[PDB]
Design a protein around this ligand. Structure first.
Ligand SMILES: Nc1nc2c(ncn2[C@@H]2O[C@H](COP(=O)(O)OP(=O)(O)NP(=O)(O)O)[C@@H](O)[C@H]2O)c(=O)[nH]1
Length: 300
């Protein structure tokens, strides 16, 4: 029930938060407007809120419901369906190496997610290597090097400002030579220039093909739930630039903006591989839609 308390701030307005809104009320246009306002304040987003209201209105009409309290169950089903469409756990087994290209802006949890994932894979018996492909941020590169040395995890890094694609190429070659199961590659996160960063990512992906026609095996976006709609605009920008195959959504604990997960799910349809629900390694949890919905909707 750790997930339940990590969602405590989001549950004021969503899930169990619906109970106080519906109590004793009739289903009418006023109620659907109050619900729409609550969804929007919770960062569910305009398009996804409209879809939820439309589907809920139709679902209640088909059953000729009049008691607003029963909208709780319909919302649980319908918001559950939104998340079920992006429930698909990441499987990194069986490659040599499985290459995860980590993309996203700076400051939203990318290097922390790299460390937690690396520790989780090693805890499962997989060997891990890191590639310090954010080559102009010497602090980020030093962070991976020092942390990897402490953890007996090899880190491939080159001089400040080295070509990111070449660093990652060299890391894949090294991983293949050293029986590495998983290679996790960091990338630059300065999206102030759309064209440049997005051209760098395309170059990285093309260069990988010299060594493995299947690499990268996962392109993972990291976004921060506490940034609300910025998480959605970041996903949209990276989705148009590169072939995203997974999303990690960090910092759900302690934000009232957790509703953004429904917007990310609905707008892009990309699997949410992990959600960050605390500061421990194990608090980067593989995303399971039914578990999340149960925690969000359970009262108390
Ligand atoms: N509570 C919480 N904090 C998280 C989570 N994921 C990352 N963080 C925190 O947010 C920060 C991580 O951001 P970070 O990975 O440093 O982003 P970055 O771009 O790699 N680094 P920088 O901050 O130098 O730009 C740290 O405070 C880290 O502990 C999460 O799921 N929950």
């Amino acid at each position: 029930a750790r997930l339940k308390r990590s969602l405590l701030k989001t549950k004021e307005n969503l899930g169990s938060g619906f109970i106080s809104l519906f109590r004793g009320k009739k289903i009418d246009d006023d109620l659907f407007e109050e619900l729409e306002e609550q969804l929007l304040i919770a960062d569910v987003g305009v398009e996804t809120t409209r879809k939820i209201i439309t589907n809920l209105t139709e679902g209640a009409s088909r059953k000729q419901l009049r008691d607003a309290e029963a909208l709780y169950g319909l919302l649980k089903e319908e918001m559950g369906e939104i998340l079920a469409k992006v429930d698909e756990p990441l499987n990194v087994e069986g490659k040599a190496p499985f290459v995860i290209l980590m993309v996203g802006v700076n400051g939203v949890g990318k290097t922390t997610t790299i460390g937690k994932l690396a520790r989780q894979f090693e805890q499962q018996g997989k060997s891990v290597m890191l590639a310090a492909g954010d080559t102009f941020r010497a602090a980020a590169v030093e962070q991976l090097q020092v942390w990897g040395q402490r953890n007996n995890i090899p880190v491939i890094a080159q001089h400040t400002g080295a070509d990111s694609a070449s660093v990652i190429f060299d890391a894949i070659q090294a991983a293949k030579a050293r029986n590495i199961d998983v290679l996790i590659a960091d990338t630059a996160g300065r999206l102030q220039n759309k064209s440049h960063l997005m051209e760098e990512l395309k170059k990285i992906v093309r260069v990988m093909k010299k060594l493995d026609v299947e690499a990268p095996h996962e392109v993972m976006l990291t976004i921060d739930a506490s940034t609300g709609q910025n998480a959605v605009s970041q996903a949209k920008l990276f989705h148009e630039a590169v072939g995203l195959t997974g999303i990690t959504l960090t910092k759900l604990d302690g934000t009232a903006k957790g509703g953004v997960i429904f917007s990310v799910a609905d707008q892009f349809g990309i699997p949410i591989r992990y959600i960050g629900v605390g500061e421990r390694i194990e608090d980067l949890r593989p995303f399971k839609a039914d578990d999340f919905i149960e925690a969000l909707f359970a009262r108390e």
